[PDB]
Write a protein that holds these residues in place. Structure first.
Motif, mmCIF file in Angstrom:
data_model
loop_
_atom_site.group_PDB
_atom_site.id
_atom_site.type_symbol
_atom_site.label_atom_id
_atom_site.label_comp_id
_atom_site.label_asym_id
_atom_site.label_seq_id
_atom_site.Cartn_x
_atom_site.Cartn_y
_atom_site.Cartn_z
ATOM 1 N N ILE A 29 -9.245 -27.580 33.804
ATOM 2 C CA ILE A 29 -8.682 -28.969 33.865
ATOM 3 C C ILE A 29 -7.114 -28.842 33.882
ATOM 4 O O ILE A 29 -6.622 -27.790 34.293
ATOM 5 C CB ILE A 29 -9.266 -29.929 32.758
ATOM 6 N N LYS A 30 -6.293 -29.852 33.547
ATOM 7 C CA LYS A 30 -4.839 -29.566 33.501
ATOM 8 C C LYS A 30 -4.362 -29.318 32.071
ATOM 9 O O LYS A 30 -3.185 -29.059 31.815
ATOM 10 C CB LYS A 30 -3.921 -30.543 34.242
ATOM 11 N N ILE A 31 -5.302 -29.399 31.151
ATOM 12 C CA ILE A 31 -5.060 -29.076 29.757
ATOM 13 C C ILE A 31 -5.967 -27.888 29.507
ATOM 14 O O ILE A 31 -7.182 -27.976 29.618
ATOM 15 C CB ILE A 31 -5.329 -30.258 28.780
ATOM 16 N N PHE A 32 -5.397 -26.784 29.132
ATOM 17 C CA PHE A 32 -6.189 -25.579 29.062
ATOM 18 C C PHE A 32 -6.997 -25.352 27.811
ATOM 19 O O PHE A 32 -6.519 -25.490 26.683
ATOM 20 C CB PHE A 32 -5.304 -24.349 29.270
ATOM 21 N N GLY A 33 -8.268 -25.043 28.060
ATOM 22 C CA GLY A 33 -9.131 -24.567 27.009
ATOM 23 C C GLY A 33 -8.439 -23.309 26.541
ATOM 24 O O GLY A 33 -8.470 -22.951 25.364
ATOM 25 N N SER A 34 -7.921 -22.624 27.600
ATOM 26 C CA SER A 34 -7.069 -21.416 27.575
ATOM 27 C C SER A 34 -7.747 -20.251 28.321
ATOM 28 O O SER A 34 -8.048 -20.303 29.510
ATOM 29 C CB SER A 34 -6.722 -20.999 26.128
ATOM 30 N N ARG A 35 -7.915 -19.231 27.537
ATOM 31 C CA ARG A 35 -8.596 -17.973 27.764
ATOM 32 C C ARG A 35 -8.710 -17.502 26.338
ATOM 33 O O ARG A 35 -8.023 -16.619 25.827
ATOM 34 C CB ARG A 35 -7.985 -16.987 28.797
ATOM 35 N N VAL A 36 -9.610 -18.270 25.755
ATOM 36 C CA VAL A 36 -9.958 -18.377 24.347
ATOM 37 C C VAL A 36 -10.173 -17.138 23.491
ATOM 38 O O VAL A 36 -10.446 -16.020 23.931
ATOM 39 C CB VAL A 36 -11.197 -19.304 24.237
ATOM 40 N N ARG A 37 -10.002 -17.458 22.213
ATOM 41 C CA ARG A 37 -10.157 -16.576 21.080
ATOM 42 C C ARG A 37 -11.511 -16.779 20.400
ATOM 43 O O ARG A 37 -11.847 -17.885 19.971
ATOM 44 C CB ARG A 37 -9.070 -16.921 20.051
ATOM 45 N N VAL A 38 -12.279 -15.710 20.311
ATOM 46 C CA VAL A 38 -13.557 -15.736 19.609
ATOM 47 C C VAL A 38 -13.595 -14.560 18.633
ATOM 48 O O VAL A 38 -13.231 -13.438 18.975
ATOM 49 C CB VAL A 38 -14.776 -15.741 20.558
ATOM 50 N N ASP A 39 -14.040 -14.843 17.425
ATOM 51 C CA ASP A 39 -14.037 -13.868 16.323
ATOM 52 C C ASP A 39 -14.843 -12.549 16.469
ATOM 53 O O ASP A 39 -14.346 -11.513 16.037
ATOM 54 C CB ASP A 39 -14.397 -14.586 15.011
ATOM 55 N N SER A 40 -16.049 -12.529 17.042
ATOM 56 C CA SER A 40 -16.796 -11.244 17.072
ATOM 57 C C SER A 40 -17.638 -10.942 18.327
ATOM 58 O O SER A 40 -18.657 -10.261 18.206
ATOM 59 C CB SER A 40 -17.681 -11.138 15.832
ATOM 60 N N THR A 41 -17.247 -11.425 19.506
ATOM 61 C CA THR A 41 -18.028 -11.190 20.753
ATOM 62 C C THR A 41 -19.363 -11.965 20.752
ATOM 63 O O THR A 41 -19.814 -12.447 21.785
ATOM 64 C CB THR A 41 -18.310 -9.672 20.965
ATOM 65 N N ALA A 42 -19.972 -12.094 19.586
ATOM 66 C CA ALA A 42 -21.216 -12.841 19.429
ATOM 67 C C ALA A 42 -21.029 -14.301 19.839
ATOM 68 O O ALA A 42 -21.899 -14.908 20.458
ATOM 69 C CB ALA A 42 -21.713 -12.747 17.993
ATOM 70 N N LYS A 43 -19.880 -14.860 19.472
ATOM 71 C CA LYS A 43 -19.581 -16.256 19.771
ATOM 72 C C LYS A 43 -19.103 -16.471 21.223
ATOM 73 O O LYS A 43 -18.996 -17.605 21.676
ATOM 74 C CB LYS A 43 -18.570 -16.801 18.757
ATOM 75 N N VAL A 44 -18.819 -15.397 21.959
ATOM 76 C CA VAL A 44 -18.436 -15.542 23.373
ATOM 77 C C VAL A 44 -19.683 -15.987 24.150
ATOM 78 O O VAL A 44 -19.610 -16.658 25.178
ATOM 79 C CB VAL A 44 -17.826 -14.255 23.999
ATOM 80 N N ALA A 45 -20.831 -15.575 23.609
ATOM 81 C CA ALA A 45 -22.158 -15.889 24.139
ATOM 82 C C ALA A 45 -22.415 -17.401 24.178
ATOM 83 O O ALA A 45 -23.037 -17.900 25.112
ATOM 84 C CB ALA A 45 -23.233 -15.187 23.325
ATOM 85 N N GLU A 46 -21.971 -18.121 23.143
ATOM 86 C CA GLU A 46 -22.177 -19.575 23.080
ATOM 87 C C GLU A 46 -21.506 -20.248 24.283
ATOM 88 O O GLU A 46 -22.033 -21.216 24.832
ATOM 89 C CB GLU A 46 -21.634 -20.197 21.776
ATOM 90 N N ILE A 47 -20.326 -19.757 24.660
ATOM 91 C CA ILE A 47 -19.598 -20.298 25.809
ATOM 92 C C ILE A 47 -20.452 -20.152 27.080
ATOM 93 O O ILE A 47 -20.507 -21.055 27.913
ATOM 94 C CB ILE A 47 -18.248 -19.567 25.989
ATOM 95 N N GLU A 48 -21.084 -18.987 27.227
ATOM 96 C CA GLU A 48 -21.981 -18.723 28.357
ATOM 97 C C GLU A 48 -23.149 -19.726 28.365
ATOM 98 O O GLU A 48 -23.560 -20.226 29.411
ATOM 99 C CB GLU A 48 -22.474 -17.265 28.275
ATOM 100 N N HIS A 49 -23.682 -19.979 27.171
ATOM 101 C CA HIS A 49 -24.784 -20.929 26.956
ATOM 102 C C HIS A 49 -24.379 -22.353 27.394
ATOM 103 O O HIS A 49 -25.172 -23.102 27.957
ATOM 104 C CB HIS A 49 -25.295 -20.902 25.515
#
Lengths: 513, 513, 513
Positions: free
Chosen positions: B236-256
């Motif tokens: 969008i024009k406001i960035f989610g970013s290229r986010v920070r996730v604590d243990s790789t496990a939570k990167v999975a939720e983004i995929e979901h």
């Protein structure tokens, strides 16, 4: 360095050159057979402007170093008093500079010669005695309302084949306008099509915008809403940066917040029965879906100038944030609808209760000449309001100029001293105007001058230059008249403004550094 | 305003040069024995466009300093009310300028000559209901639908080998087009394949885009979906970013979370029975796998202009966020499929309930001349629409021009004073058209003028210039006719444009309306 | 091959350039308010020549390589036939070349446009039978003798303030000059004495010479002697030498020989009764004493040109050595005397028996203008001699040209062939003459042309351009008429002359290119 310095003849010469250059362009402009001039300049001009009004083009541009911009600036103040009609005041001033050649014949003492301007004060006085007027154009007035001076302002302009009819219309516009209101709420636009009238008078205000493909065709018992601030929400003064909210589900509430803006608008809207919304800027998409289902017609990016005119018309509004609905705003309710003009569809606001703010829609062939009407209507609206306000006018077609010329010729012989030589030069200046009006007609100037002087001398103020005839005729039958104060101001302004530059020996200036 | 110092004769010359320069190039264009055109350019034009349509090329570019672009701009106004048949209005305006050379000898007032054009208004008016023409043009029609004027417009075009057949096709297109709305939703696409017919008529709209290699080839009882917002989700024009996730496990939720966007699209797509999806912008990859299995054909980055016409065609729909399916979307159902047309594959939309909007497809030999067909169709469509509403047209091939010329010659000596010199010159202007029409034909122009005049003088309106024969013949059998309004407007327009040329001090660039 | 190239497009231009250069200088000259022009040349030119008459100056000089000299040569043959009036024939041919720019644009057979000249011949018949000329000037004639064409011929000349009275005199001169007799025998000299009449008519030949203070005042029954060989004696064929003789007193016999020369002169002289002796050269002093006592008046260094006319006048003689007297000499005897004219002393020979040789004496202020009378008289004499014997003339003031113009325009459109474009161009040539006569007058040219055509079209031959009036009027009241020969020769010659210039190249002799 080199600040501009001029010595003896050159200083006077710079003033001399500025006056001659202006006169040739302006001369074709004067009287019922004028010409359209267009001019092109560099950036911040956006290209070509075509002006038939001599004052407008000179005021706009400071083309070069030679002095003339200040002489030009004064003509606008004249315009406030009356101004227009036809431009000619500038031309007479220019003529005065040419006799400076005979001044070197007298060899060195111009200040005494300057007495000619004092003499000019006498010349101006008899211009007020001689060259009659009309009586009063007392108020509203039946036949005498127009078919007079506006037509003459227009005559120098070619659009007059059908335009003169348009000019006649503008008096009606001035009559409603008149009061302690002064000049406000007058808007004009030209439209594509083909009619003999070439113009419609609207009791209300005319726009040119549509909500979108969807929305009701017509509204009744209409309520009008005007908003200063746009329907767009999100970016604000501070972005609130990049969000970052524990988890991510919360960002969804932001979308929910958007729904609230939609919801606030609908709840206020339904109770009122709102039939139309006008916003002077970009409009947010969510609102748009709402308006279509409700049966409300909205306008996107309506020009601010149109909106101000409209507020006087509808009783106005406070115009704030979404609290703006209900009684903080006043809505007029006659009828708002999209109407095909003839070939092109437009939106009409009409039936305003107030009645002193109206919009006129012009129609025509469709080209530069029609835009010429934009030029003409502006002149026509302003002239007529002045004609009633002044309560005095003079005969047109150069009738005023020749009689004044007859009176001034004996003045030269009457005065003795220093006053006499200068007095006759001012007098001969008036002679060119009769010649210029006839020349553009297509008839021989020499013959024209002969008959003209003879008729004015007799004592008939009504008699003037008739271009249509090819000789001279009765100006009054034509109906052509000129506002009285246009003549008073030129007489004092033309003399002294020209006087300053001839009087002064140089222009020292100053370098930028 | 005021920069380019040109005055009187030099100023006149710039107008003079512009008219002669354009006259020779457009000269080839006017008759059945016209010629195609080749253009070369640098600076984002990328390709040579072949255009013998004078209006199209003149509008696209403002090539040089001398003024002509505004004069050029005006012919388009003629175009919506008619525009074509063959170009000619520009030639007549230009021819008037050359005799201005004899007017410097005259050395008087350019404006006085101008009275001829006001006189020309009389010529315009009396060139009306004077010509003697064809009536009919009932509606739809049996055999007068074409093989007439469209063919003549085409004759001046190099394509008239295979192409004259193409023109014949165009009237069928206009028959469906009749009603109130005049020109909405008409689209034409060039095809590089070879066919003797050289054209195919589509009952719907033509695009040229594909979802991907996989997906069902054909869809029945198709539902149409259009989305304003792209399938793509992330920045969008406001960035989610290229986010920070604590243990790789939570990167999975983004995929979901990505899966959820897919889920909404499939679950309600199925209920509708969705057969095709059209989105104007970038499409996200995940849904693409889904569409293939479902049996739904989607279009990535579809052009917005195609979509708007399509909406009118389908019945329209409200475009918003993924909630857009079912009722908020209106889908027309007939046949949507991708059909190979002898060479480059395209997608065909057809069977529109509305019927107002239609698409014409062209095929040809395969060359520059083939691209020419795009050029020819634009002229063909406009003529027929005008032919039905006007209910009046005039004999073509210059038949109209000679008749009027014989009548105007009488007028010059008979009229008083200034009117006589003016009217006589206007009359001789008509003479050049017969000469221009004959010259491109392949037969001697000198011989042609004399023989032409004798037949028109006699009283046979049907008789006119026959270019293939090289002599005079019967125009009606040939089928060349001109719309009645082409003649009404040209007569009034030609006089006004010529008239302003002498009057204006400088020319330069476009701004009016 | 080194001589100048130039063919078709390049060759045409050289002819084109020559025609335009000549037309501007000649246009000023035409009509009553025409202008005088002079040229400066070096080498074999002892004077600056002021030539009002276009034919005289063009014949005199071949200034440069560019086109003009052959075209020029043609006009003098016309002069012999009639020549003058006003110089218009050269102007008409020159304007023909201007249409050629249109012709290149035409793009057909350049040679076909040539047929236009053949067409022009048809136009010539149009001139001959479509106008009424005058039906006057039967012989000598009372009132119609002058105050007509001579006045117009002199109209182009400045010295017409009193000259028109002189022009009037010229007819009287031709009346004596009409008949079987030769056209020379005419001598004109301007005098420094002044009076309102400004001219005197003599019964014979006027000369300005005196023998000396002594001699009788008047001679009657006069006999005239003209001698080729001078009265002077001494040097002989071969230098006698610087000669010494036997004695100082033998030089005396040499003096005595002179006495013998004296004796022969008186012996032959007394028997005849010799009243006057005229010698064209130096005269020896001894005989002079003798003439005084005898009562015989002699003339020293009489100009040869006066003598040749005189011989025809007296009856002639064989001018040889002193064997000259008696029968070999023929002498008329009315009256030979010296009176006094104004200041300067002149001798008058008059009452000649032959009667076909006569002298007119002009009197004037002095300056350039008096010289101008010399230019004035020359074209007055020629006009009248043609006017009496022809028995025809045409109406002046341009009446003839406009009527013909009305007749010619219809014909170009009606006549079949290459003829139609060609004939019309010839017709417009006639239009300029009305313009040229009016332009010199100073009135606005367009108004003049237009008003003129309406009266001629109507059917009034007498009506024409009245310069004094400023409009149109009855030419016959003025009495102005043009010689019939000028119209027949001009029409035949103009077409032949016009055809040839286009046909050629370089323009007769000078240097390469």
């Amino acid at each position: 360095a080199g600040a501009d310095e001029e010595r003896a003849e050159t200083a006077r010469l710079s003033s001399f050159i500025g006056a001659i250059a202006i006169g040739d362009l302006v001369k074709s402009t004067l009287g019922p057979k004028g010409m359209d001039k267009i001019l092109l300049s560099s950036g911040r001009d956006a290209s070509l402007m075509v002006t038939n009004d001599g004052a407008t083009i000179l005021k706009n541009i400071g083309v070069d170093n030679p002095a003339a911009k200040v002489l030009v600036d004064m003509s606008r103040v004249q315009d406030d008093e009356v101004g227009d009609g036809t431009t000619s005041v500038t031309v007479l001033a220019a003529e005065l500079l040419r006799e400076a050649e005979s001044l070197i014949a007298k060899k060195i003492h111009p200040q005494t010669i300057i007495a000619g301007w004092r003499e000019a004060t006498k010349a101006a006085r008899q211009a007020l005695l001689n060259s009659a007027v009309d009586h009063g154009s007392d108020e509203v007035k039946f036949r005498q309302d127009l078919m007079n001076i506006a037509g003459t302002t227009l005559s120098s302009k070619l659009l007059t084949h059908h335009k003169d009819h348009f000019t006649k219309l503008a008096v009606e516009a001035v009559l409603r306008l008149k009061g302690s209101g002064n000049l406000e709420a007058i808007h004009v636009i030209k439209k594509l099509g083909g009619s003999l009238a070439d113009s419609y008078l609207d009791e209300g205000f005319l726009l040119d915008k549509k909500i979108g493909v969807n929305q009701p065709k017509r509204i009744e018992n209409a309520k009008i809403l005007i908003a200063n601030t746009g329907m767009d929400t999100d970016k604000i003064k501070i972005f609130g940066s990049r969000v970052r909210v524990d988890s991510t589900a919360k960002v969804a509430e932001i979308e929910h917040a958007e729904k609230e803006k939609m919801k606030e608008k609908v709840e206020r809207i339904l109770k009122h029965g709102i039939n139309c919304f006008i916003n002077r800027q970009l409009i947010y998409n969510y609102p748009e879906q709402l308006f279509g289902a409700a049966g409300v017609m909205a306008i996107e990016h309506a020009d601010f100038v149109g909106v101000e005119r409209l507020a006087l018309v509808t009783g106005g509004e406070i115009a704030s944030t979404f609290d703006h609905p209900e009684l903080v705003k006043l809505g007029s309710c006659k009828l708002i609808e999209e109407v095909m003009i003839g070939e092109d569809k437009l939106i009409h606001f009409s039936g305003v209760a107030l009645g002193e703010a109206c919009t006129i829609v012009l129609r025509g062939a469709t080209q530069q000449i029609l835009d010429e009407a934009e030029r003409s209507l502006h002149d026509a609206l302003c002239v007529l309001a002045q004609t009633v306000k002044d309560s005095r006018t003079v005969y047109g077609g150069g009738c005023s100029e020749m009689l004044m010329a007859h009176a001034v010729t004996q003045l030269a012989s009457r005065t003795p001293g220093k006053e006499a030589v200068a007095m006759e030069s001012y007098a001969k200046a008036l002679r060119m105007l009769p010649t210029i009006i006839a020349d553009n007609a297509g008839y021989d100037s020499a013959d024209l001058v002969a008959q003209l002087r003879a008729a004015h001398s007799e004592g008939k103020t009504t008699a003037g230059l008739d271009m249509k005839e090819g000789t001279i005729g009765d100006m009054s039958v034509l109906g052509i008249t000129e506002s009285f104060q246009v003549k008073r101001q030129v007489l004092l302004s033309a003399a002294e403004a020209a006087e300053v530059i001839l009087r002064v020996d140089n222009i020292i200036k100053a370098a930028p550094r």
